[PDB]
Amino acid sequence: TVSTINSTDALAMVEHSSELTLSITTPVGTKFVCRTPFIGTHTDKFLLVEMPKISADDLQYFFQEGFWMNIRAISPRGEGALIHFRSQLMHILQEPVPMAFLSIPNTMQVSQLRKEPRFELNLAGKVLFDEHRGDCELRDLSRSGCRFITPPLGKTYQVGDLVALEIFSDLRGTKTFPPLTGKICNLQRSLHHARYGLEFNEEGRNNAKNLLAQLKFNGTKLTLNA
């Protein structure tokens, strides 16, 4: 799962100048999110960062000494990794150059990212198999495969079947993205669900890459950009 290690080792995984994401919560409970480059660290005393490129007002309201924040750093190690930790804004300097000094916790949590990230969704569409079309809902998607559900009492598919998912790309479902083609690699029938796992073929992988690109992230998940 996730690993908790010493901050010195966790930060060694991060490249200087890389971007940090700051989720700030002010003393009165208001929230703000910004990003700023990671300078480096001083011994084990401070985490140095550049002043966020935000309006003077936002700096005034959300970037004051003493304020706490949850920071998320990135690491290129392996297929990537995310480093999460909580830090307090200790000092701000304007001379010789504007920069902030954050606190360093004893440990940080490191999350290894997957080679092929999976996205959770719920996009209606059609399943095309042997010239017949049925309804389906895309529930999980990665550049290599996906998971979809269909009406438990509609047409049934068997493992090994070459199907094509025609996902609606519009608000009212009439237009569809290029088809996600592949073979059913697994399935599960229950009283209320017909669950299927699809493994894309070359064509399917390209259209999947294209579909992920047309989608918009709402802060929680990918959805139709409309």
Place this chain on the structure above:
Amino acid sequence: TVSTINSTDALAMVEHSSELTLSITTPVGTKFVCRTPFIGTHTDKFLLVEMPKISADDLQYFFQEGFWMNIRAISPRGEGALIHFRSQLMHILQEPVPMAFLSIPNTMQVSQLRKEPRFELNLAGKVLFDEHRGDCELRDLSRSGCRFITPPLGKTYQVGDLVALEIFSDLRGTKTFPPLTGKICNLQRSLHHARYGLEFNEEGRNNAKNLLAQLKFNGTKLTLNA
């Protein structure tokens, strides 16, 4: 050969917290050398470093704002690389924490290191071949092979000969390091020189690794530690 590239790209090759070597020349011409960790950089404005761990007096005499220095940074990229550039000490801070701000030049010179570094030397010894010993001088050495010279009028060796170099390990040449064994891979005879290139076998490589370890670096080259 050596490459000259933009400092932003050159510094991206260096890992934060890694050690920097500072060769300082004061305004009155005196010289000093110290090492200190690399913090990171602020945008393209400054190179941040930790205060060198030297005596107060040395800091007073060699680490003042305005002083120029030649810096050498290391990079793990490839078999390694050395980044050389000149920098001026722009600002020193004591609060929130002691740290120095150095200038960043437009470009830096990057030198790729070899997988198997070669050392220049001149260590007398004996060449053992077919039970006979002759004089020689070790002139070049790496973990995998070496170059040595012998009296142009002494015994001659041919390419492919399995010889053993018994390098004297003491001040007056009577004791020798474990033998550097291998095959002559090339040679060159001149009026004043008999030059040979040796390729170590397994045994030779181990003794070579051991010999490099017993040697002392005088600041210019490796020599007998005595």
